[PDB]
Amino acid sequence: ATTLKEAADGAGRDFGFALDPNRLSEAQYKAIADSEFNLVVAENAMKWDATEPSQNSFSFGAGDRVASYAADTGKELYGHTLVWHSQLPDWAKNLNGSAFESAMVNHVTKVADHFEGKVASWDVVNEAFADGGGRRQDSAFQQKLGNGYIETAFRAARAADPTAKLCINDYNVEGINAKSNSLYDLVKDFKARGVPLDCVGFQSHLIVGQVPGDFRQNLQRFADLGVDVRITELDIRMRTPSDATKLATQAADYKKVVQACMQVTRCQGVTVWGITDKYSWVPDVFPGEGAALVWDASYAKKPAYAAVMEAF
Numbered sequence: 001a002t003t004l005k006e007a008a009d010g011a012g013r014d015f016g017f018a019l020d021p022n023r024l025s026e027a028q029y030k031a032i033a034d035s036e037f038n039l040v041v042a043e044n045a046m047k048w049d050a051t052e053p054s055q056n057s058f059s060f061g062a063g064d065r066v067a068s069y070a071a072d073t074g075k076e077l078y079g080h081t082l083v084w085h086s087q088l089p090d091w092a093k094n095l096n097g098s099a100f101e102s103a104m105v106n107h108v109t110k111v112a113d114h115f116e117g118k119v120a121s122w123d124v125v126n127e128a129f130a131d132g133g134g135r136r137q138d139s140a141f142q143q144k145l146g147n148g149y150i151e152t153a154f155r156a157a158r159a160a161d162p163t164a165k166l167c168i169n170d171y172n173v174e175g176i177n178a179k180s181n182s183l184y185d186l187v188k189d190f191k192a193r194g195v196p197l198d199c200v201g202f203q204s205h206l207i208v209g210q211v212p213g214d215f216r217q218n219l220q221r222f223a224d225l226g227v228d229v230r231i232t233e234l235d236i237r238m239r240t241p242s243d244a245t246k247l248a249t250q251a252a253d254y255k256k257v258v259q260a261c262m263q264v265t266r267c268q269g270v271t272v273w274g275i276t277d278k279y280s281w282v283p284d285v286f287p288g289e290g291a292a293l294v295w296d297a298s299y300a301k302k303p304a305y306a307a308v309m310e311a312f
Ligand SMILES: O[C@@H]1[C@@H](O)[C@H](O[C@@H]2CCNC[C@H]2O)OC[C@H]1O
Pocket: 043, 044, 203, 233, 281
C-alpha cells in the first residue's frame, strides 16, 4: 500500500483522524486528510459547547462541515461526543435536578437526530469513570444525576437514532486495571439487561515507552461481552524536542497498539487524535510534552507512519 488508508482498507479496518473543520482551508492539511484515512471524527465540532451554546439553541455549522467532509470524501463518520463532563457550557452546569436531566436528554436527542443517517457510531458517554476505579468525581452528570445518567443517555440516543452504534469511551482503560474493570462491569451490566450499547472506545492517549502489555488481552475480554471495540484517540506523547531514540520507541509503540487491534476480530480500527504535531492538543495540556502524532509540524511522515502500515 502507498497510504495508511489502503493499509487499513486492506485489513478490513478503519484508520481515522480527529478533524478541525477550520484546517480544511489549509491544502496540506486537507491533502493528508483526503488520502491517509478512511474515517473521520470531529475533534471539537460535535461537542456540547460547539452544538448547544444556549439552552435548546443549536449551532450545527461546524458539525455539518465535518459531516459534509466525510460524505464528500467517502469516509466513515464517527460522532464525538454527546455527554461529557468537559466543555459543557455554564448554562447547563447552572441547572440541576430534573431540569438538568432534561437538558441532557434534549441534547442527546437533538444532536443524534440531526446527524442520523450520517454519523455511523456515537460516543454517547465519554470519560464516565475515574483512574483507580469507580465513577468520575468531578462530573456534573455524576454529581447531579447519579449512576443512572449513563443508561438514560444511551436509551435516549437509541430512541433518537435506532441504527447507529452507541459507544462509551474513556482513557486509562487500555490495560486491565481498576478503571477498565469498572468500565467492564458497566458494559456487562448493560448487555445483560438489554441497555442499548454496541461498542467501547479506548482513547489511548499514551506516553512513549509505556504501552500496556495486556492491551490486547483487555480488548478481547470486552469484545467477548458481545460489543465492538475501537482505539479512538491515539497519540503517544514524549518529552520535546524529539530525537531518533524517542521517535524509534514511538514507532514501536504505534505498532504495538495497531497490532493489539489487529489481533481482536471485533476491533473496528484505530483513530489518531489529529494529523500533525503542529496542531496536536498535547503541548497545551501537557507542558513540555508533544510530538505525539504520525506527522511532524512540517507534515513529514515520522517513523510511526511506517510502523502503522506494517501493523495493518
Ligand atoms: O482541542 C482539544 C481536544 O483535542 C480535546 O479532545 C479531548 C482529548 C481527551 N479525550 C477527550 C477529547 O474530547 O479536548 C480539549 C480541546 O481543547
